[PDB]
mmCIF file with all atom_site columns, all heavy atoms in Angstrom:
data_model
loop_
_atom_site.group_PDB
_atom_site.id
_atom_site.type_symbol
_atom_site.label_atom_id
_atom_site.label_alt_id
_atom_site.label_comp_id
_atom_site.label_asym_id
_atom_site.label_entity_id
_atom_site.label_seq_id
_atom_site.pdbx_PDB_ins_code
_atom_site.Cartn_x
_atom_site.Cartn_y
_atom_site.Cartn_z
_atom_site.occupancy
_atom_site.B_iso_or_equiv
_atom_site.pdbx_formal_charge
_atom_site.auth_seq_id
_atom_site.auth_comp_id
_atom_site.auth_asym_id
_atom_site.auth_atom_id
_atom_site.pdbx_PDB_model_num
ATOM 1   N N   . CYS A 1 1  ? 235.365 87.341 40.807 1.00 0.00 ? 1  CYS A N   1
ATOM 2   C CA  . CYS A 1 1  ? 235.643 86.955 39.420 1.00 0.00 ? 1  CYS A CA  1
ATOM 3   C C   . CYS A 1 1  ? 235.595 88.214 38.543 1.00 0.00 ? 1  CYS A C   1
ATOM 4   O O   . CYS A 1 1  ? 234.546 88.897 38.484 1.00 0.00 ? 1  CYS A O   1
ATOM 5   C CB  . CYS A 1 1  ? 234.620 85.948 38.966 1.00 0.00 ? 1  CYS A CB  1
ATOM 6   S SG  . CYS A 1 1  ? 234.866 85.317 37.323 1.00 0.00 ? 1  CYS A SG  1
ATOM 7   N N   . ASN A 1 2  ? 236.629 88.486 37.792 1.00 0.00 ? 2  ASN A N   1
ATOM 8   C CA  . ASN A 1 2  ? 236.680 89.615 36.939 1.00 0.00 ? 2  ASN A CA  1
ATOM 9   C C   . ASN A 1 2  ? 236.480 89.165 35.441 1.00 0.00 ? 2  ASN A C   1
ATOM 10  O O   . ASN A 1 2  ? 236.717 89.967 34.553 1.00 0.00 ? 2  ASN A O   1
ATOM 11  C CB  . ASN A 1 2  ? 237.904 90.460 37.020 1.00 0.00 ? 2  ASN A CB  1
ATOM 12  C CG  . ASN A 1 2  ? 239.224 89.685 36.617 1.00 0.00 ? 2  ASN A CG  1
ATOM 13  O OD1 . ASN A 1 2  ? 239.121 88.549 36.098 1.00 0.00 ? 2  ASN A OD1 1
ATOM 14  N ND2 . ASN A 1 2  ? 240.311 90.337 36.761 1.00 0.00 ? 2  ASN A ND2 1
ATOM 15  N N   . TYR A 1 3  ? 236.086 87.927 35.208 1.00 0.00 ? 3  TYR A N   1
ATOM 16  C CA  . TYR A 1 3  ? 235.642 87.406 33.956 1.00 0.00 ? 3  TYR A CA  1
ATOM 17  C C   . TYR A 1 3  ? 236.759 87.236 32.954 1.00 0.00 ? 3  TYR A C   1
ATOM 18  O O   . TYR A 1 3  ? 236.562 87.300 31.758 1.00 0.00 ? 3  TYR A O   1
ATOM 19  C CB  . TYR A 1 3  ? 234.569 88.379 33.282 1.00 0.00 ? 3  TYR A CB  1
ATOM 20  C CG  . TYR A 1 3  ? 233.215 88.405 34.077 1.00 0.00 ? 3  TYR A CG  1
ATOM 21  C CD1 . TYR A 1 3  ? 232.318 89.374 33.804 1.00 0.00 ? 3  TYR A CD1 1
ATOM 22  C CD2 . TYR A 1 3  ? 232.976 87.435 35.029 1.00 0.00 ? 3  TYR A CD2 1
ATOM 23  C CE1 . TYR A 1 3  ? 231.139 89.447 34.461 1.00 0.00 ? 3  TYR A CE1 1
ATOM 24  C CE2 . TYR A 1 3  ? 231.785 87.480 35.727 1.00 0.00 ? 3  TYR A CE2 1
ATOM 25  C CZ  . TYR A 1 3  ? 230.861 88.445 35.451 1.00 0.00 ? 3  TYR A CZ  1
ATOM 26  O OH  . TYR A 1 3  ? 229.694 88.505 36.131 1.00 0.00 ? 3  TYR A OH  1
ATOM 27  N N   . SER A 1 4  ? 237.958 87.042 33.411 1.00 0.00 ? 4  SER A N   1
ATOM 28  C CA  . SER A 1 4  ? 239.108 86.942 32.519 1.00 0.00 ? 4  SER A CA  1
ATOM 29  C C   . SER A 1 4  ? 239.570 85.447 32.291 1.00 0.00 ? 4  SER A C   1
ATOM 30  O O   . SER A 1 4  ? 239.772 85.111 31.113 1.00 0.00 ? 4  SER A O   1
ATOM 31  C CB  . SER A 1 4  ? 240.279 87.723 33.127 1.00 0.00 ? 4  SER A CB  1
ATOM 32  O OG  . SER A 1 4  ? 241.424 87.590 32.225 1.00 0.00 ? 4  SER A OG  1
ATOM 33  N N   . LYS A 1 5  ? 239.678 84.663 33.323 1.00 0.00 ? 5  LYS A N   1
ATOM 34  C CA  . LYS A 1 5  ? 240.174 83.311 33.225 1.00 0.00 ? 5  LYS A CA  1
ATOM 35  C C   . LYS A 1 5  ? 239.091 82.303 33.709 1.00 0.00 ? 5  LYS A C   1
ATOM 36  O O   . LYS A 1 5  ? 238.354 82.598 34.573 1.00 0.00 ? 5  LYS A O   1
ATOM 37  C CB  . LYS A 1 5  ? 241.411 83.149 34.082 1.00 0.00 ? 5  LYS A CB  1
ATOM 38  C CG  . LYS A 1 5  ? 242.239 81.921 33.759 1.00 0.00 ? 5  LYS A CG  1
ATOM 39  C CD  . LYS A 1 5  ? 243.628 82.031 34.333 1.00 0.00 ? 5  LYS A CD  1
ATOM 40  C CE  . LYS A 1 5  ? 244.111 80.693 34.800 1.00 0.00 ? 5  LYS A CE  1
ATOM 41  N NZ  . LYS A 1 5  ? 245.355 80.827 35.665 1.00 0.00 ? 5  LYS A NZ  1
ATOM 42  N N   . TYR A 1 6  ? 239.095 81.179 32.985 1.00 0.00 ? 6  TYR A N   1
ATOM 43  C CA  . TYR A 1 6  ? 238.124 80.110 33.269 1.00 0.00 ? 6  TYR A CA  1
ATOM 44  C C   . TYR A 1 6  ? 238.827 78.779 33.305 1.00 0.00 ? 6  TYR A C   1
ATOM 45  O O   . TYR A 1 6  ? 239.905 78.601 32.735 1.00 0.00 ? 6  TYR A O   1
ATOM 46  C CB  . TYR A 1 6  ? 236.992 80.083 32.229 1.00 0.00 ? 6  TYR A CB  1
ATOM 47  C CG  . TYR A 1 6  ? 236.263 81.311 32.075 1.00 0.00 ? 6  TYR A CG  1
ATOM 48  C CD1 . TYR A 1 6  ? 236.685 82.458 31.360 1.00 0.00 ? 6  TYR A CD1 1
ATOM 49  C CD2 . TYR A 1 6  ? 235.032 81.534 32.722 1.00 0.00 ? 6  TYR A CD2 1
ATOM 50  C CE1 . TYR A 1 6  ? 236.031 83.596 31.213 1.00 0.00 ? 6  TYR A CE1 1
ATOM 51  C CE2 . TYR A 1 6  ? 234.281 82.718 32.579 1.00 0.00 ? 6  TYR A CE2 1
ATOM 52  C CZ  . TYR A 1 6  ? 234.820 83.772 31.858 1.00 0.00 ? 6  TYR A CZ  1
ATOM 53  O OH  . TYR A 1 6  ? 234.158 84.900 31.721 1.00 0.00 ? 6  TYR A OH  1
ATOM 54  N N   . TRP A 1 7  ? 238.235 77.808 34.035 1.00 0.00 ? 7  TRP A N   1
ATOM 55  C CA  . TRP A 1 7  ? 238.802 76.450 34.093 1.00 0.00 ? 7  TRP A CA  1
ATOM 56  C C   . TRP A 1 7  ? 237.706 75.446 33.858 1.00 0.00 ? 7  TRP A C   1
ATOM 57  O O   . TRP A 1 7  ? 236.506 75.702 34.173 1.00 0.00 ? 7  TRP A O   1
ATOM 58  C CB  . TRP A 1 7  ? 239.432 76.240 35.477 1.00 0.00 ? 7  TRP A CB  1
ATOM 59  C CG  . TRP A 1 7  ? 238.602 76.386 36.615 1.00 0.00 ? 7  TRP A CG  1
ATOM 60  C CD1 . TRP A 1 7  ? 238.422 77.520 37.378 1.00 0.00 ? 7  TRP A CD1 1
ATOM 61  C CD2 . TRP A 1 7  ? 237.702 75.430 37.238 1.00 0.00 ? 7  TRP A CD2 1
ATOM 62  N NE1 . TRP A 1 7  ? 237.511 77.373 38.424 1.00 0.00 ? 7  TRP A NE1 1
ATOM 63  C CE2 . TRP A 1 7  ? 237.060 76.061 38.347 1.00 0.00 ? 7  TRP A CE2 1
ATOM 64  C CE3 . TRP A 1 7  ? 237.444 74.080 36.969 1.00 0.00 ? 7  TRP A CE3 1
ATOM 65  C CZ2 . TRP A 1 7  ? 236.124 75.386 39.162 1.00 0.00 ? 7  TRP A CZ2 1
ATOM 66  C CZ3 . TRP A 1 7  ? 236.567 73.430 37.748 1.00 0.00 ? 7  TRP A CZ3 1
ATOM 67  C CH2 . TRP A 1 7  ? 235.900 74.047 38.849 1.00 0.00 ? 7  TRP A CH2 1
ATOM 68  N N   . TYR A 1 8  ? 238.082 74.291 33.388 1.00 0.00 ? 8  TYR A N   1
ATOM 69  C CA  . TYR A 1 8  ? 237.085 73.217 33.072 1.00 0.00 ? 8  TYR A CA  1
ATOM 70  C C   . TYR A 1 8  ? 237.783 71.851 33.179 1.00 0.00 ? 8  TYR A C   1
ATOM 71  O O   . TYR A 1 8  ? 239.021 71.769 33.282 1.00 0.00 ? 8  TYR A O   1
ATOM 72  C CB  . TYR A 1 8  ? 236.488 73.402 31.661 1.00 0.00 ? 8  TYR A CB  1
ATOM 73  C CG  . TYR A 1 8  ? 237.521 73.474 30.576 1.00 0.00 ? 8  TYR A CG  1
ATOM 74  C CD1 . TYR A 1 8  ? 237.949 72.383 29.901 1.00 0.00 ? 8  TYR A CD1 1
ATOM 75  C CD2 . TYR A 1 8  ? 238.011 74.738 30.123 1.00 0.00 ? 8  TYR A CD2 1
ATOM 76  C CE1 . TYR A 1 8  ? 238.858 72.443 28.878 1.00 0.00 ? 8  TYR A CE1 1
ATOM 77  C CE2 . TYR A 1 8  ? 238.937 74.801 29.171 1.00 0.00 ? 8  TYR A CE2 1
ATOM 78  C CZ  . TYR A 1 8  ? 239.331 73.689 28.509 1.00 0.00 ? 8  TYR A CZ  1
ATOM 79  O OH  . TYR A 1 8  ? 240.264 73.784 27.500 1.00 0.00 ? 8  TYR A OH  1
ATOM 80  N N   . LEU A 1 9  ? 237.004 70.779 33.174 1.00 0.00 ? 9  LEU A N   1
ATOM 81  C CA  . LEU A 1 9  ? 237.498 69.458 33.313 1.00 0.00 ? 9  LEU A CA  1
ATOM 82  C C   . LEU A 1 9  ? 237.368 68.717 31.994 1.00 0.00 ? 9  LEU A C   1
ATOM 83  O O   . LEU A 1 9  ? 236.354 68.778 31.322 1.00 0.00 ? 9  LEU A O   1
ATOM 84  C CB  . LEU A 1 9  ? 236.685 68.702 34.396 1.00 0.00 ? 9  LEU A CB  1
ATOM 85  C CG  . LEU A 1 9  ? 237.034 69.098 35.857 1.00 0.00 ? 9  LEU A CG  1
ATOM 86  C CD1 . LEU A 1 9  ? 236.034 68.340 36.783 1.00 0.00 ? 9  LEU A CD1 1
ATOM 87  C CD2 . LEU A 1 9  ? 238.469 68.710 36.182 1.00 0.00 ? 9  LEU A CD2 1
ATOM 88  N N   . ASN A 1 10 ? 238.468 68.075 31.575 1.00 0.00 ? 10 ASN A N   1
ATOM 89  C CA  . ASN A 1 10 ? 238.540 67.256 30.393 1.00 0.00 ? 10 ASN A CA  1
ATOM 90  C C   . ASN A 1 10 ? 238.525 65.781 30.739 1.00 0.00 ? 10 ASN A C   1
ATOM 91  O O   . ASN A 1 10 ? 239.134 65.329 31.708 1.00 0.00 ? 10 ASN A O   1
ATOM 92  C CB  . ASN A 1 10 ? 239.849 67.514 29.616 1.00 0.00 ? 10 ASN A CB  1
ATOM 93  C CG  . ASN A 1 10 ? 239.755 67.245 28.145 1.00 0.00 ? 10 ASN A CG  1
ATOM 94  O OD1 . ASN A 1 10 ? 239.626 66.115 27.738 1.00 0.00 ? 10 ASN A OD1 1
ATOM 95  N ND2 . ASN A 1 10 ? 239.829 68.311 27.294 1.00 0.00 ? 10 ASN A ND2 1
ATOM 96  N N   . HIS A 1 11 ? 237.758 65.041 29.940 1.00 0.00 ? 11 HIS A N   1
ATOM 97  C CA  . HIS A 1 11 ? 237.892 63.604 29.887 1.00 0.00 ? 11 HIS A CA  1
ATOM 98  C C   . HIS A 1 11 ? 238.985 63.210 28.913 1.00 0.00 ? 11 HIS A C   1
ATOM 99  O O   . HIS A 1 11 ? 238.820 63.435 27.699 1.00 0.00 ? 11 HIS A O   1
ATOM 100 C CB  . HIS A 1 11 ? 236.542 62.951 29.495 1.00 0.00 ? 11 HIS A CB  1
ATOM 101 C CG  . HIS A 1 11 ? 236.374 61.533 30.032 1.00 0.00 ? 11 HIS A CG  1
ATOM 102 N ND1 . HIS A 1 11 ? 237.163 60.523 29.550 1.00 0.00 ? 11 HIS A ND1 1
ATOM 103 C CD2 . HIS A 1 11 ? 235.475 61.030 30.921 1.00 0.00 ? 11 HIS A CD2 1
ATOM 104 C CE1 . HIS A 1 11 ? 236.802 59.377 30.191 1.00 0.00 ? 11 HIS A CE1 1
ATOM 105 N NE2 . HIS A 1 11 ? 235.812 59.687 30.990 1.00 0.00 ? 11 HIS A NE2 1
ATOM 106 N N   . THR A 1 12 ? 240.059 62.616 29.444 1.00 0.00 ? 12 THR A N   1
ATOM 107 C CA  . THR A 1 12 ? 241.265 62.422 28.600 1.00 0.00 ? 12 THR A CA  1
ATOM 108 C C   . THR A 1 12 ? 240.971 61.538 27.391 1.00 0.00 ? 12 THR A C   1
ATOM 109 O O   . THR A 1 12 ? 241.404 61.891 26.301 1.00 0.00 ? 12 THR A O   1
ATOM 110 C CB  . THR A 1 12 ? 242.354 61.823 29.477 1.00 0.00 ? 12 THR A CB  1
ATOM 111 O OG1 . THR A 1 12 ? 241.948 60.566 29.927 1.00 0.00 ? 12 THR A OG1 1
ATOM 112 C CG2 . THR A 1 12 ? 242.699 62.763 30.611 1.00 0.00 ? 12 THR A CG2 1
ATOM 113 N N   . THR A 1 13 ? 240.210 60.478 27.540 1.00 0.00 ? 13 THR A N   1
ATOM 114 C CA  . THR A 1 13 ? 239.941 59.562 26.439 1.00 0.00 ? 13 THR A CA  1
ATOM 115 C C   . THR A 1 13 ? 238.717 59.981 25.686 1.00 0.00 ? 13 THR A C   1
ATOM 116 O O   . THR A 1 13 ? 238.775 60.083 24.466 1.00 0.00 ? 13 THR A O   1
ATOM 117 C CB  . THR A 1 13 ? 239.821 58.111 27.039 1.00 0.00 ? 13 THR A CB  1
ATOM 118 O OG1 . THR A 1 13 ? 238.524 58.003 27.612 1.00 0.00 ? 13 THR A OG1 1
ATOM 119 C CG2 . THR A 1 13 ? 240.909 57.847 28.025 1.00 0.00 ? 13 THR A CG2 1
ATOM 120 N N   . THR A 1 14 ? 237.568 60.143 26.384 1.00 0.00 ? 14 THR A N   1
ATOM 121 C CA  . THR A 1 14 ? 236.353 60.505 25.688 1.00 0.00 ? 14 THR A CA  1
ATOM 122 C C   . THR A 1 14 ? 236.407 61.797 24.986 1.00 0.00 ? 14 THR A C   1
ATOM 123 O O   . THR A 1 14 ? 235.918 61.971 23.854 1.00 0.00 ? 14 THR A O   1
ATOM 124 C CB  . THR A 1 14 ? 235.139 60.436 26.656 1.00 0.00 ? 14 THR A CB  1
ATOM 125 O OG1 . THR A 1 14 ? 235.247 59.269 27.528 1.00 0.00 ? 14 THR A OG1 1
ATOM 126 C CG2 . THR A 1 14 ? 233.867 60.414 25.900 1.00 0.00 ? 14 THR A CG2 1
ATOM 127 N N   . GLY A 1 15 ? 237.012 62.797 25.586 1.00 0.00 ? 15 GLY A N   1
ATOM 128 C CA  . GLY A 1 15 ? 237.068 64.145 25.076 1.00 0.00 ? 15 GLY A CA  1
ATOM 129 C C   . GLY A 1 15 ? 235.960 65.100 25.540 1.00 0.00 ? 15 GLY A C   1
ATOM 130 O O   . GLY A 1 15 ? 236.044 66.231 25.248 1.00 0.00 ? 15 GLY A O   1
ATOM 131 N N   . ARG A 1 16 ? 234.956 64.545 26.272 1.00 0.00 ? 16 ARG A N   1
ATOM 132 C CA  . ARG A 1 16 ? 233.914 65.397 26.718 1.00 0.00 ? 16 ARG A CA  1
ATOM 133 C C   . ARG A 1 16 ? 234.372 66.301 27.837 1.00 0.00 ? 16 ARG A C   1
ATOM 134 O O   . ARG A 1 16 ? 235.224 65.848 28.662 1.00 0.00 ? 16 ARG A O   1
ATOM 135 C CB  . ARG A 1 16 ? 232.714 64.585 27.188 1.00 0.00 ? 16 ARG A CB  1
ATOM 136 C CG  . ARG A 1 16 ? 233.003 63.646 28.326 1.00 0.00 ? 16 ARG A CG  1
ATOM 137 C CD  . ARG A 1 16 ? 231.740 62.912 28.840 1.00 0.00 ? 16 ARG A CD  1
ATOM 138 N NE  . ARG A 1 16 ? 230.732 63.806 29.228 1.00 0.00 ? 16 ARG A NE  1
ATOM 139 C CZ  . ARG A 1 16 ? 229.960 63.661 30.327 1.00 0.00 ? 16 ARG A CZ  1
ATOM 140 N NH1 . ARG A 1 16 ? 230.121 62.567 31.110 1.00 0.00 ? 16 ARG A NH1 1
ATOM 141 N NH2 . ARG A 1 16 ? 228.998 64.510 30.593 1.00 0.00 ? 16 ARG A NH2 1
ATOM 142 N N   . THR A 1 17 ? 233.877 67.515 27.925 1.00 0.00 ? 17 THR A N   1
ATOM 143 C CA  . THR A 1 17 ? 234.297 68.499 28.922 1.00 0.00 ? 17 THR A CA  1
ATOM 144 C C   . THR A 1 17 ? 233.056 69.028 29.687 1.00 0.00 ? 17 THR A C   1
ATOM 145 O O   . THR A 1 17 ? 231.909 68.740 29.292 1.00 0.00 ? 17 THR A O   1
ATOM 146 C CB  . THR A 1 17 ? 235.010 69.648 28.272 1.00 0.00 ? 17 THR A CB  1
ATOM 147 O OG1 . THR A 1 17 ? 234.103 70.418 27.473 1.00 0.00 ? 17 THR A OG1 1
ATOM 148 C CG2 . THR A 1 17 ? 236.140 69.153 27.434 1.00 0.00 ? 17 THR A CG2 1
ATOM 149 N N   . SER A 1 18 ? 233.271 69.743 30.723 1.00 0.00 ? 18 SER A N   1
ATOM 150 C CA  . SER A 1 18 ? 232.254 70.342 31.537 1.00 0.00 ? 18 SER A CA  1
ATOM 151 C C   . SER A 1 18 ? 232.164 71.836 31.221 1.00 0.00 ? 18 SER A C   1
ATOM 152 O O   . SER A 1 18 ? 233.032 72.382 30.551 1.00 0.00 ? 18 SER A O   1
ATOM 153 C CB  . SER A 1 18 ? 232.535 70.150 33.027 1.00 0.00 ? 18 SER A CB  1
ATOM 154 O OG  . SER A 1 18 ? 233.725 70.800 33.416 1.00 0.00 ? 18 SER A OG  1
ATOM 155 N N   . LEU A 1 19 ? 231.124 72.477 31.738 1.00 0.00 ? 19 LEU A N   1
ATOM 156 C CA  . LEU A 1 19 ? 230.898 73.913 31.479 1.00 0.00 ? 19 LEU A CA  1
ATOM 157 C C   . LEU A 1 19 ? 231.960 74.665 32.286 1.00 0.00 ? 19 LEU A C   1
ATOM 158 O O   . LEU A 1 19 ? 232.066 74.474 33.501 1.00 0.00 ? 19 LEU A O   1
ATOM 159 C CB  . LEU A 1 19 ? 229.528 74.326 31.932 1.00 0.00 ? 19 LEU A CB  1
ATOM 160 C CG  . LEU A 1 19 ? 229.131 75.808 31.689 1.00 0.00 ? 19 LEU A CG  1
ATOM 161 C CD1 . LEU A 1 19 ? 229.136 76.095 30.216 1.00 0.00 ? 19 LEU A CD1 1
ATOM 162 C CD2 . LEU A 1 19 ? 227.838 76.095 32.274 1.00 0.00 ? 19 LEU A CD2 1
ATOM 163 N N   . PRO A 1 20 ? 232.784 75.487 31.617 1.00 0.00 ? 20 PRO A N   1
ATOM 164 C CA  . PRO A 1 20 ? 233.884 76.204 32.327 1.00 0.00 ? 20 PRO A CA  1
ATOM 165 C C   . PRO A 1 20 ? 233.293 77.107 33.430 1.00 0.00 ? 20 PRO A C   1
ATOM 166 O O   . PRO A 1 20 ? 232.312 77.742 33.236 1.00 0.00 ? 20 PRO A O   1
ATOM 167 C CB  . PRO A 1 20 ? 234.601 77.012 31.212 1.00 0.00 ? 20 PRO A CB  1
ATOM 168 C CG  . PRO A 1 20 ? 234.234 76.264 29.957 1.00 0.00 ? 20 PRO A CG  1
ATOM 169 C CD  . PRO A 1 20 ? 232.852 75.699 30.182 1.00 0.00 ? 20 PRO A CD  1
ATOM 170 N N   . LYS A 1 21 ? 234.076 77.072 34.573 1.00 0.00 ? 21 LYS A N   1
ATOM 171 C CA  . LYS A 1 21 ? 233.805 78.033 35.646 1.00 0.00 ? 21 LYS A CA  1
ATOM 172 C C   . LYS A 1 21 ? 235.001 78.985 35.747 1.00 0.00 ? 21 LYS A C   1
ATOM 173 O O   . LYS A 1 21 ? 236.109 78.637 35.536 1.00 0.00 ? 21 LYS A O   1
ATOM 174 C CB  . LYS A 1 21 ? 233.594 77.326 36.964 1.00 0.00 ? 21 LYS A CB  1
ATOM 175 C CG  . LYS A 1 21 ? 232.487 76.317 36.925 1.00 0.00 ? 21 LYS A CG  1
ATOM 176 C CD  . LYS A 1 21 ? 232.385 75.514 38.219 1.00 0.00 ? 21 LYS A CD  1
ATOM 177 C CE  . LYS A 1 21 ? 231.497 76.167 39.242 1.00 0.00 ? 21 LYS A CE  1
ATOM 178 N NZ  . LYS A 1 21 ? 230.256 76.658 38.591 1.00 0.00 ? 21 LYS A NZ  1
ATOM 179 N N   . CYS A 1 22 ? 234.694 80.240 36.114 1.00 0.00 ? 22 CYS A N   1
ATOM 180 C CA  . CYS A 1 22 ? 235.711 81.260 36.080 1.00 0.00 ? 22 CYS A CA  1
ATOM 181 C C   . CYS A 1 22 ? 236.615 81.139 37.298 1.00 0.00 ? 22 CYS A C   1
ATOM 182 O O   . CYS A 1 22 ? 236.266 80.677 38.396 1.00 0.00 ? 22 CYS A O   1
ATOM 183 C CB  . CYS A 1 22 ? 235.090 82.652 35.985 1.00 0.00 ? 22 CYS A CB  1
ATOM 184 S SG  . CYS A 1 22 ? 234.480 83.306 37.548 1.00 0.00 ? 22 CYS A SG  1
ATOM 185 N N   . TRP A 1 23 ? 237.870 81.641 37.089 1.00 0.00 ? 23 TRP A N   1
ATOM 186 C CA  . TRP A 1 23 ? 238.908 81.505 38.114 1.00 0.00 ? 23 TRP A CA  1
ATOM 187 C C   . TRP A 1 23 ? 238.791 82.662 39.053 1.00 0.00 ? 23 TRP A C   1
ATOM 188 O O   . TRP A 1 23 ? 238.653 83.816 38.632 1.00 0.00 ? 23 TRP A O   1
ATOM 189 C CB  . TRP A 1 23 ? 240.278 81.580 37.439 1.00 0.00 ? 23 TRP A CB  1
ATOM 190 C CG  . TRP A 1 23 ? 241.412 80.939 38.225 1.00 0.00 ? 23 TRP A CG  1
ATOM 191 C CD1 . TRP A 1 23 ? 242.044 81.483 39.249 1.00 0.00 ? 23 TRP A CD1 1
ATOM 192 C CD2 . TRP A 1 23 ? 241.999 79.661 37.964 1.00 0.00 ? 23 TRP A CD2 1
ATOM 193 N NE1 . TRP A 1 23 ? 243.027 80.640 39.694 1.00 0.00 ? 23 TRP A NE1 1
ATOM 194 C CE2 . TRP A 1 23 ? 243.056 79.494 38.933 1.00 0.00 ? 23 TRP A CE2 1
ATOM 195 C CE3 . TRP A 1 23 ? 241.784 78.637 37.028 1.00 0.00 ? 23 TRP A CE3 1
ATOM 196 C CZ2 . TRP A 1 23 ? 243.812 78.315 38.992 1.00 0.00 ? 23 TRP A CZ2 1
ATOM 197 C CZ3 . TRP A 1 23 ? 242.550 77.525 37.093 1.00 0.00 ? 23 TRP A CZ3 1
ATOM 198 C CH2 . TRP A 1 23 ? 243.546 77.368 38.062 1.00 0.00 ? 23 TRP A CH2 1
ATOM 199 N N   . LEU A 1 24 ? 238.804 82.395 40.363 1.00 0.00 ? 24 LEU A N   1
ATOM 200 C CA  . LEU A 1 24 ? 238.674 83.435 41.326 1.00 0.00 ? 24 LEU A CA  1
ATOM 201 C C   . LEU A 1 24 ? 239.968 84.201 41.508 1.00 0.00 ? 24 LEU A C   1
ATOM 202 O O   . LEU A 1 24 ? 241.051 83.737 41.083 1.00 0.00 ? 24 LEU A O   1
ATOM 203 C CB  . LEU A 1 24 ? 238.250 82.857 42.695 1.00 0.00 ? 24 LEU A CB  1
ATOM 204 C CG  . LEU A 1 24 ? 236.926 82.152 42.720 1.00 0.00 ? 24 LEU A CG  1
ATOM 205 C CD1 . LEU A 1 24 ? 236.556 81.713 44.153 1.00 0.00 ? 24 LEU A CD1 1
ATOM 206 C CD2 . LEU A 1 24 ? 235.830 83.001 42.049 1.00 0.00 ? 24 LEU A CD2 1
ATOM 207 N N   . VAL A 1 25 ? 239.898 85.390 42.045 1.00 0.00 ? 25 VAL A N   1
ATOM 208 C CA  . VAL A 1 25 ? 241.035 86.302 42.151 1.00 0.00 ? 25 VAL A CA  1
ATOM 209 C C   . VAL A 1 25 ? 241.078 86.929 43.558 1.00 0.00 ? 25 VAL A C   1
ATOM 210 O O   . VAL A 1 25 ? 240.061 87.232 44.158 1.00 0.00 ? 25 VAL A O   1
ATOM 211 C CB  . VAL A 1 25 ? 240.963 87.418 41.095 1.00 0.00 ? 25 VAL A CB  1
ATOM 212 C CG1 . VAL A 1 25 ? 239.658 88.255 41.217 1.00 0.00 ? 25 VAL A CG1 1
ATOM 213 C CG2 . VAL A 1 25 ? 242.198 88.287 41.093 1.00 0.00 ? 25 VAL A CG2 1
ATOM 214 N N   . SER A 1 26 ? 242.347 87.058 44.082 1.00 0.00 ? 26 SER A N   1
ATOM 215 C CA  . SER A 1 26 ? 242.591 87.690 45.344 1.00 0.00 ? 26 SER A CA  1
ATOM 216 C C   . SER A 1 26 ? 243.903 88.426 45.225 1.00 0.00 ? 26 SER A C   1
ATOM 217 O O   . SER A 1 26 ? 244.787 88.041 44.497 1.00 0.00 ? 26 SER A O   1
ATOM 218 C CB  . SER A 1 26 ? 242.598 86.739 46.511 1.00 0.00 ? 26 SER A CB  1
ATOM 219 O OG  . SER A 1 26 ? 243.819 86.008 46.508 1.00 0.00 ? 26 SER A OG  1
ATOM 220 N N   . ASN A 1 27 ? 243.932 89.611 45.906 1.00 0.00 ? 27 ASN A N   1
ATOM 221 C CA  . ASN A 1 27 ? 245.153 90.453 45.894 1.00 0.00 ? 27 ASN A CA  1
ATOM 222 C C   . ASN A 1 27 ? 245.523 90.863 44.451 1.00 0.00 ? 27 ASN A C   1
ATOM 223 O O   . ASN A 1 27 ? 246.680 91.206 44.189 1.00 0.00 ? 27 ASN A O   1
ATOM 224 C CB  . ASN A 1 27 ? 246.354 89.757 46.517 1.00 0.00 ? 27 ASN A CB  1
ATOM 225 C CG  . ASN A 1 27 ? 246.488 89.973 47.994 1.00 0.00 ? 27 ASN A CG  1
ATOM 226 O OD1 . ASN A 1 27 ? 245.501 90.076 48.721 1.00 0.00 ? 27 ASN A OD1 1
ATOM 227 N ND2 . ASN A 1 27 ? 247.716 90.066 48.452 1.00 0.00 ? 27 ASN A ND2 1
#
């Protein structure tokens, strides 16, 4: 992880989200 991109989960109706985790990188 080079600390650039992150992903998280959205609740479509409620709107609550989770703590983002960073996107892994290869090549």
